[PDB]
């Protein structure tokens, strides 16, 4: 049985990592009903968008949502993890970020307080994540210049 | 139209709405949305993961 | 299948249709399914009158 959207937000990181598809779905099934415009097709043409800037304003909100999706898919793309929800990398874990052991992290902490504890070094980790790939780019570069 | 046993049946030039004029030229066209996602069995499995 | 329809002229008319497109071969007669004094008969000619 599945706890529902964001159900494991108070669960251990391992339990939420088991239901990450659940959190992944609310990125799409909020935006499937709005792009549908099936219940919007007939109601006063296109919900009277003439002299109603809330209609455009509403539309701009829909744009922000798909724009955020594109930000996350871009990050998964430049880290070579586009197709997968869980991917391992080559970046070693610098201990200065967090000193907690594996058992304490995955069976004693929630993703919220973890993201709060590591929000300080997120940019650095992303930099290593954008950098580390670059050594794969370079190995492919060796295969390119023969 | 009038059930008079085929006696009455008179056709007058109505002054119908303009949408009927659009229907007169849109009779051949139709709008559809593409659902490009199909799933089918071919008895092949991705055993290996990653 | 087409990306865009053919050129449709927005001819404002009420009794007779003007400057439209002609059905090929025989003329065409269009009513709804019920056909009993309730709809509006649409006629598309094969030869245009001037």
């Amino acid at each position, epitope marked *: 049985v599945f706890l529902g959207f964001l159900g494991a937000a108070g669960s251990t990181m391992g339990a939420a990592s088991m239901t990450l598809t659940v959190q992944a779905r609310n990125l799409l099934s909020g935006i499937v009903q709005q792009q549908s415009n099936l219940l919007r097709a*007939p*109601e*006063c043409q296109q919900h009277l968008l003439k002299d109603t800037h809330w209609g455009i304003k509403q539309l701009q909100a829909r744009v922000l949502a798909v724009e955020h999706y594109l930000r996350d898919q871009q990050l998964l793309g430049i880290w070579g993890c586009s197709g997968k929800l869980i991917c391992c990398t080559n970046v070693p874990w610098n201990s200065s970020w967090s000193n907690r052991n594996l058992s304490e992290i995955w069976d004693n902490m929630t993703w919220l307080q973890w993201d709060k504890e590591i929000s300080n070094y997120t940019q650095i980790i992303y930099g290593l994540l954008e950098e580390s790939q670059n050594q794969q780019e370079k190995n492919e570069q060796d295969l390119l210049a023969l | *139209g*009038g*059930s*008079t046993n085929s006696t*009455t049946e008179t056709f007058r030039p*109505g*002054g*119908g*709405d303009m*949408r009927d004029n659009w229907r007169s030229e849109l009779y051949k066209y139709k709008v559809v949305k593409i659902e490009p996602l199909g799933v089918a069995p071919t008895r092949c499995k991705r055993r290996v993961v990653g | 299948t087409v990306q865009c329809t053919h050129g449709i002229k927005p001819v404002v008319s*009420t009794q007779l249709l003007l400057n439209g497109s002609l059905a090929e071969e025989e003329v065409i007669i269009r009513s*709804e399914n*019920i056909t*009993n*004094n*309730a709809k509006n008969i649409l006629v598309q000619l094969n030869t245009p009158v001037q």
Partner: antibody
Amino acid sequence: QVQLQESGPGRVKPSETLSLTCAVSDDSFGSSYFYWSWIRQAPGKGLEWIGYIAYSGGVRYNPSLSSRVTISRNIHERQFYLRLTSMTAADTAVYYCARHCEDDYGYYSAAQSYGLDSWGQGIAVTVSP
Amino acid sequence: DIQMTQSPSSLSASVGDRVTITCRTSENVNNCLNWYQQKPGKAPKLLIYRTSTLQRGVPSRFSGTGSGTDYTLTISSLQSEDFGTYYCQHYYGTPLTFGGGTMVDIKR
């Protein structure tokens, strides 16, 4: 809509012409796919649909009184009228104006009423010299 | 043209009874029929403007069924403000017809 004000002469002599007026308040007139009908009811007997005028223009009346009935529609005046020539004592009845919307598309913001949901107050027209 | 008939012509029922009224049409109307209530003296108030679709301001104790040439209005639990004369009307093209009517008073 809810205010269909009727007016006219409740007293008509024989062989004359009966003209009646039905004014609409809620401006549902300008909305398309609306049919505005005139209906009379003889006492004790049933109700008889006289004629209807469409959103484009008055198409049909009742075949019995087809040549002696003319329904007009003054767009901007917000009203629509009925005319009945050669008034006889058999036409002495109670007259109403009623509205109903039929949509071939079923394609609107809300659901419409196929039946006659809007009715006037009724005019009692009597005929005698 | 199309003619309509109601059964019974005069009916006298009690409060709370499941009452039915039959409206027979001469020709197939394709689910196009309306039921109306008229207290004597007032304009006919609309009840059901399709085969089964109820209008608003109307309590839930009313219902209409049927197809083809036979249609039935039904009241599960009658009330006090349900007297008067009831009519049926088809809107299947021009011209429009009305039923004879069903005088419904309270039983005695």
